[PDB]
Design a protein around this ligand. Sequence first.
Ligand SMILES: OC[C@H]1O[C@H](O[C@@H]2[C@H](O)[C@@H](OC[C@H]3O[C@@H](O)[C@@H](O)[C@@H](O)[C@@H]3O)O[C@H](CO[C@H]3O[C@H](CO)[C@@H](O)[C@H](O)[C@@H]3O[C@H]3O[C@H](CO)[C@@H](O)[C@H](O)[C@@H]3O)[C@H]2O)[C@@H](O)[C@@H](O)[C@@H]1O
Ligand SMILES: [Ca+2]
Ligand SMILES: [Ca+2]
Ligand SMILES: [Mn+2]
Ligand SMILES: [Mn+2]
Lengths: 240, 240
Amino acid sequence: QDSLSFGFPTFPSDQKNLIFQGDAQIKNNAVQLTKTDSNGNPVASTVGRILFSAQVHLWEKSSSRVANFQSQFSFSLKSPLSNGADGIAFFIAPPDTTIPSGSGGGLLGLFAPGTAQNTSANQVIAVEFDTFYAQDSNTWDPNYPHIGIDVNSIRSVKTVKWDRRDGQSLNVLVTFNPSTRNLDVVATYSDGTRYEVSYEVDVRSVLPEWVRVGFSAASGEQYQTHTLESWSFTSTLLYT
Amino acid sequence: QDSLSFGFPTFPSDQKNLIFQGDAQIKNNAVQLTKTDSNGNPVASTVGRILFSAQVHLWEKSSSRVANFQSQFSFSLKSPLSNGADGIAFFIAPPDTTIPSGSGGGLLGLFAPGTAQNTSANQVIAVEFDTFYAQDSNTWDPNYPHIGIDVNSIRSVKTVKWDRRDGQSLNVLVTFNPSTRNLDVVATYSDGTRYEVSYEVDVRSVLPEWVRVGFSAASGEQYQTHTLESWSFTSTLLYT
Ligand SMILES: OC[C@H]1O[C@H](O[C@@H]2[C@H](O)[C@@H](OC[C@H]3O[C@@H](O)[C@@H](O)[C@@H](O)[C@@H]3O)O[C@H](CO[C@H]3O[C@H](CO)[C@@H](O)[C@H](O)[C@@H]3O[C@H]3O[C@H](CO)[C@@H](O)[C@H](O)[C@@H]3O)[C@H]2O)[C@@H](O)[C@@H](O)[C@@H]1O
Ligand SMILES: [Ca+2]
Ligand SMILES: [Ca+2]
Ligand SMILES: [Mn+2]
Ligand SMILES: [Mn+2]
């Protein structure tokens, strides 16, 4: 289909169109991407992702069209630790994408260690909300929590300083305009605090015509819950 | 998801979210539900169906919500003869539905012979555009071409006389309002000729909470092409 749209105001346990990978699962009408014990407390060494089952037609060679899409979502992070890790990411990848081996911790369940910074060995666009930046293990990160736009590499092509707020929902709007090729990100907390970051990228030189969209999160030695609370998505093919 | 929508202005050959059953295939940017030979001519004894891969949340027992849906599509029938058969139908059924054994010809690929008229033995709602009504084989049909609403039976609960026009596209709008429980069908040819039929039905007592939507068509001894040209669908769970 040229246009596809779906909305999850909440996430009831009875799901049919979501592909669950790793430790991801539904709990309390929300998606817990990373594993939690019986009490709902976060544990270390966990990775989880979800993908919408239907494939998205991102662009079309034959007609020279590229999709205009928008993804609105909200999540919250919780951790008794002063350094909760590792972060959550909204991503776009080939339909057959699976959790790479050894992609836990700072790799956010998105990249394999050997090629994490090799933009030539990956096909993925992601918006990360990174909370762990220890310069000795996450050598590619700026030295502070950040929102980053990732294009085939865990080393963000762009980051902006971000404030992690325990237990507070962050509302995010990610949009792509094929005319300008601008990928825009706008995130806000309930008190009006706002973050914005934009990047110009030709998606058809990075991703295949058909893709799947979803979220990924992970925790290595340090941990925190990565709770996806709501999500709506829409995409339509436009001439360019 | 509480809401889902998709639109196929046309049907390019590289499809990812369509389940093809029987002889259904893509040709000339359209979906040919029934088989055709090398030169695009309809053949006898053929059945085919397509369903969208993503499951539709028609109703939710916990929240007491029922979905409002709208399906818009256009199709054309072509036949060298004059009494082309058997018809095309838009339908809603459980997710695992498949072509029943011996559901060819007049059964439109939707019902099994032995239970075609047993309401308590089926789970399907369909809007049929029936062009063949010979009383010896299609004993359940009115004695003229017709559009009908089928609820768990090949014997429509409501029909309206219809005019089959070889090679002309019929634009169809099917809507279901949970508030009134009215399933409305409006079909029109380009010249404005309009046909309408509706019926009150509580989907909760006929179908499971999650379903799949698609089209079915068949030709028995008499034949005609059943060309699905475009299709858009949208559903939203609502509180009545
Ligand atoms: O250096 C000060 C920082 O310490 C803490 O962070 C550490 C640090 O970045 C580094 O330390 C290595 C070793 O240091 C020793 O002194 C001991 O503390 C050892 O226990 C420690 O291993 O690496 C630590 C491990 O990094 C993993 O976890 C982080 C956070 O979750 C991830 O971002 C990394 O990618 C990495 O995960 C990978 O390894 C995991 C197993 O080790 C595995 O489970 C994952 O799948 C993934 O492969 C790190 O904890 C911390 O207190 C900082 O705040 C402080 O600045
Ligand atoms: Ca990091
Ligand atoms: Ca008939
Ligand atoms: Mn980062
Ligand atoms: Mn009939």
